[PDB]
A = this chain, B = another copy of it.
Amino acid sequence: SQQVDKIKASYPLFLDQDYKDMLAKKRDGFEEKYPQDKIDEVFQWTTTKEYQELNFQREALTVNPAKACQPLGAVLCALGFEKTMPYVHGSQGCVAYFRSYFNRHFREPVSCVSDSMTEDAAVFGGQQNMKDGLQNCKATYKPDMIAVSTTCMAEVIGDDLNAFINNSKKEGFIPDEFPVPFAHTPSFVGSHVTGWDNMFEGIARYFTLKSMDDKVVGSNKKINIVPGFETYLGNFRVIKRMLSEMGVGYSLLSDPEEVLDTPADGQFRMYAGGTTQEEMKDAPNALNTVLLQPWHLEKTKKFVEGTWKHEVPKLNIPMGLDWTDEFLMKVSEISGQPIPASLTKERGRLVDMMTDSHTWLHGKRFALWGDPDFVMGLVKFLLELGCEPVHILCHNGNKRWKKAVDAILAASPYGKNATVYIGKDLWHLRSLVFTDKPDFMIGNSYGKFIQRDTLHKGKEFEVPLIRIGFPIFDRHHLHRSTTLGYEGAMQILTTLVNSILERLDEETRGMQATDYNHDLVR
């Protein structure tokens, strides 16, 4: 039943008595459900340390992973270039999924095409698919460049992307001068960030490898900036803004900020902004190249150091106070531009916010997860805040990254209770937050289920989720946020301290029970 003036959606409509009785009848009659006491016993068991040991003994099963596959990162990288169509050679279902994933995170159109390889291509290869698809894409969506990656089907059958594209050009399917950079992006290797790395290296190779004769390092008085896999628009914007305030000439390579934030003014813009082909061609003339997320830009680093001959600085991701300081000082040294008074004042204001909020931040225990560079930047900032990271999970991390993070933790008295987990998923993390309960989680939307689980053990065991990372599907416009620089540190600090304060307010909202501590002033 529905009251026309107070229509109910699924919640709370299915809490109506008739629906409740119907669901009870369905369960009792036909579901053959396990008894509720058995379900409670098994759940309690899943919260135990013994279950945690069994869970961490997993070798073949992965449950609730915290990573995606390479072509997703390849598509994100390709979207950062001017009038560029991401083109995944392989099966179309992958492209449907990539597009929907990015649509839900960014709440924006995401342009990507597939050559729709099918059973016939599984034996004969997808060369005809490549020829037809390149021609159709160029004719229909008129990009200035088509950036090609692969689905796992094409990788397994061993489709030669270079040969396929060269044959497409030779047979006249696309013009010879039309730029078609490519990158093999096997989904069974690494993760989405690896696909971003491979795609960027492929594009940079396409535009620079055969024209290095006339390049002179430092000719253009600029610094190349490679952002890596980045899903906060504010991060691109803050890097560009900070470099502008320093008066530092820069080239942001793979800049998708415009195309992921087009205005709603009655017109659909398939393309907007992005790194121009001329910028990529002139990139070897830069003073140096700075990789914002070095731990997934290894192949790009090797190409840039070995071909462009740039002396890429050893810089951590510019997250938090110390690492933003190091980034800015390295930029000052490379460019010769002093750090201006505006950035010094912004740093001082971040320090002021830290001083104002340290009493609520100090000693707070966090589990967290995400990509390696993001995770280590978050850990470093939490250590700078006096917070205690307890469970540090990076599903797509490696042993060298783990060693670096352990060194960072050992550099601080606030990291003595921390453990770093690589190759572990969010079911492992669920066990961790049950057996060694933190105050909060920091992660993507998939953490909400963990919170749900913890609440089912009881309100006292609930671990609230703070949504920082990718993907965030159950909140709106968080992709506009910033995590890098002093501005990003300010935003993260505000989110953390206010999450703590909202939790405290919730715990002290009980009248005559806990509201003695429901302070007006915090």
Binding site for B on A (CB under 8 A): 9-12, 14-15, 104, 107-108, 261-265, 344-349, 351-357, 360, 445-446, 448-449, 451-453, 455-456, 473-478, 480, 490, 493-494, 497-498, 501-502, 504-505, 507-511, 514-522
Given contacts A12-B514, A449-B520, A455-B509, 4 further A-B contacts (CB under 8 A): A264-B352, A353-B476, A476-B494, A478-B498
Contact partner, A477, options B265, B451, B490, B504, Cβ 8 Å? B490
A241: min CB distance to chain B, Å: 12
A59: min CB distance to chain B, Å: 27
A511 x B456 contact (CB < 8 A)? yes
Bound Cα distance from A122 to B477, whole angstroms: 58
A113: min CB distance to chain B, Å: 24
A355: min CB distance to chain B, Å: 5
Bound Cα distance from A12 to B515, whole angstroms: 11
| Copies of the polypeptide in the assembly | 2
Contact partner, A357, options B445, B476, B480, Cβ 8 Å? B476
Which single residue of chain B is at the shortest CB-CB distance from A515? B452
B476 x A360 contact (CB < 8 A)? yes
A448 x B357 contact (CB < 8 A)? no
Bound Cα distance from A492 to B494, whole angstroms: 16
Bound Cα distance from A476 to B480, whole angstroms: 21
Q: Given A494-B476, A509-B455, A511-B455, A516 and B356 touching (CB < 8 A)?
A: no
Contact partner, A505, options B448, B516, B517, Cβ 8 Å? B448
Provide the main secondary structure of the chain A interface: helix
B501 x A451 contact (CB < 8 A)? no
B11 x A516 contact (CB < 8 A)? yes
B474 x A521 contact (CB < 8 A)? yes
Bound Cα distance from A435 to B97, whole angstroms: 47
Bound Cα distance from A351 to B263, whole angstroms: 7
A353 x B477 contact (CB < 8 A)? yes
Contact partner, A476, options B348, B455, B497, B508, Cβ 8 Å? B497
A85: min CB distance to chain B, Å: 22
Contact partner, A514, options B15, B104, B497, Cβ 8 Å? B15
A509 x B11 contact (CB < 8 A)? no
Q: Given A360-B476, A494-B477, A511 and B348 touching (CB < 8 A)?
A: no
Taking CB atoms, residues of chain B closer than 8 Å to A11 are 504, 507-508, 514, 516-517
Q: Given A345-B263, A448-B518, A498 and B476 touching (CB < 8 A)?
A: yes
Taking CB atoms, residues of chain B closer than 8 Å to A477 are 353, 356-357, 490, 493-494, 497-498
Taking CB atoms, residues of chain B closer than 8 Å to A360 are 476
Bound Cα distance from A427 to B57, whole angstroms: 58
Which single residue of chain B is at the shortest CB-CB distance from A519? B474
Q: Given A494-B477, A515-B452, A446 and B264 touching (CB < 8 A)?
A: no
Taking CB atoms, residues of chain B closer than 8 Å to A473 are 520-522
Bound Cα distance from A97 to B193, whole angstroms: 54
Bound Cα distance from A192 to B474, whole angstroms: 40
**8 cross-chain pairs, A with B, having the tightest CB-CB distances, nearest first:** A263-B348, A264-B352, A11-B517, A456-B511, A265-B348, A473-B521, A264-B351, A474-B522
Which single residue of chain B is at the shortest CB-CB distance from A457? B511
B452 x A511 contact (CB < 8 A)? yes
